Amino acid sequence: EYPTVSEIPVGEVRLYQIADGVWSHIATQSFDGAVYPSNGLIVRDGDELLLIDTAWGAKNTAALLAEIEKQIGLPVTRAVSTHFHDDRVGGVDVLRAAGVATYASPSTRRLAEVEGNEIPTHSLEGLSSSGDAVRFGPVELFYPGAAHSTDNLVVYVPSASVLYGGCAIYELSRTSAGNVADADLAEWPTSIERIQQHYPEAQFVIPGHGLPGGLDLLKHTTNVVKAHTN
Ligand SMILES: [Cl-]
Ligand SMILES: [Cl-]
Ligand SMILES: [O-]
Ligand SMILES: [Zn+2]
Ligand SMILES: [Zn+2]
Ligand SMILES: [Zn+2]
Numbered sequence: 188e189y190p191t192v193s194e195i196p197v198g199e200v201r202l203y204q205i206a207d208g209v210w211s212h213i214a215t216q217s218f219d220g221a222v223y224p225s226n227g228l229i230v231r232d233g234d235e236l237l238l239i240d241t242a243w244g245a246k247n248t249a250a251l252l253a254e255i256e257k258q259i260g261l262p263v264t265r266a267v268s269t270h271f272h273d274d275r276v277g278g279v280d281v282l283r284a285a286g287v288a289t290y291a292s293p294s295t296r297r298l299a300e301v302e303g304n305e306i307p308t309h310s311l312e313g314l315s316s317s318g319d320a321v322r323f324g325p326v327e328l329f330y331p332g333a334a335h336s337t338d339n340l341v342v343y344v345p346s347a348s349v350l351y352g353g354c355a356i357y358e359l360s361r362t363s364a365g366n367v368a369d370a371d372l373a374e375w376p377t378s379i380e381r382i383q384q385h386y387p388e389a390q391f392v393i394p395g396h397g398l399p400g401g402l403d404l405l406k407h408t409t410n411v412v413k414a415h416t417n
Contacts, residue, residue, distance in 0.1 A: 189213075189398055192224035200242050200250045202229070202258050206347035208325070210259070211393055212251055214242035216274065225274045225396050228351045229255065229263075230344055232325040238266035238287065239326070239342050239351055241278030248278025252285055263287050267323060268307050269340040269353040271298035272369070274395070279305035290323075292330070294338040314340065318381055329385060331355065332378030333371035335395070339378075343386050350389035350402075352382065357408040358397025364415035372416050376409045 190201040190213045201213045208231030215222050227240035236259065242251040255263060266282050268275040268291045276299050279289050291299070291307035292314045299306045313321040317332035327343045334355035342351040355378065371378075383405050393399045394408075 190224075191398075192222055195224065197222065198246055198250060200247060200254045202254055205349055205391055205399075206344075207231075209344050209347045209349050211399070212242055212254070214247040214251065216243045216247065223396055226351075226393055226399075227251075227275075228342060228344075228349075228393065229259070230325045231259075231261065234261055235264040236261050237324050237326060238263045238282070240267070240269055240275045240353070241282065243274040244277045245281050248281040251278070252281070265290060265324065266307070267291065267311065267326075267328065267340070267342070268295060269342065269351075269395075270336040270338045271295045271302060271304055272336065272354070273304055275353070276305045276307060279307050283308060292338055292340065295340075298336070298338055311340075317378065318385070320385065329382070331381040331385075332374055334375040334378040335367070336369045337371060341382055341386075343389065348388060348390035349393065350382070350386050350391065351393045352395065352404065354395030355379070355382075355408070356392065356394045356404050357411055358394040359400055359404060359407055360397055361394075362411060364411055367412075367415065372412060375412045379405050379409050379412075 195215045210229040230237045241248045289307035290309040314330040320329045
């Protein structure tokens with residue numbers, strides 16, 4: 188059912204409808220010679236769409252907009268990037284050129300600028316302290332603490348019980364950390380426990396890369412992170 192990394196040529200984007208007015212978007216990218224899938228989110232709000240994260244690069248993000256127009260046909264008016272890496276902000280310039288108001292926390296914008304990644308235009312206030320939550324149209328934005336990155340946000344869709352964990356949450360198929368160059372390994376399990384504590388009702392949990400599942404993805408991620416720590 189859910190699109191897998193093997194089925195998506197690099198440059199194409201698939202959409203997966205989760206609930207009324209909630210989709211994930213799935214793209215693939217080459218990185219260090221391997222191909223990785225990557226997820227983002229689309230949430231309807233009236234006759235407009237909120238986009239969560241780019242599709243990992245300008246070409247993919249243009250394909251994303253075209254797939255949204257083809258399959259949904261409503262305009263993306265705002266976008267949120269959930270941390271500063273290129274699978275989250277790469278494509279922000281494509282969004283901006285299309286008339287999308289792009290958003291990220293000041294921390295994400297700061298880090299993207301330091302790293303040389305695309306910088307979302309608008310700032311999300313009220314998210315700088317672990318445990319902070321703010322409403323953003325049809326979603327809630329939550330800063331759980333440092334994890335995969337110091338700036339990573341999670342997104343919750345209360346109407347659909349969809350928890351988008353982004354890259355702080357691993358799919359079950361991933362049993363090793365991979366790359367954690369920007370991570371806070373010491374804090375990551377605590378940050379996951381904040382997500383659990385804040386969204387225990389979540390039914391559909393979406394990792395930054397790979398297959399969705401339930402809240403068991405949180406304990407799974409902690410297991411992997413602790414094993415890597417050791
Ligand atoms: Cl704008
Ligand atoms: Cl605006
Ligand atoms: O990432
Ligand atoms: Zn990342
Ligand atoms: Zn604006
Ligand atoms: Zn990622």
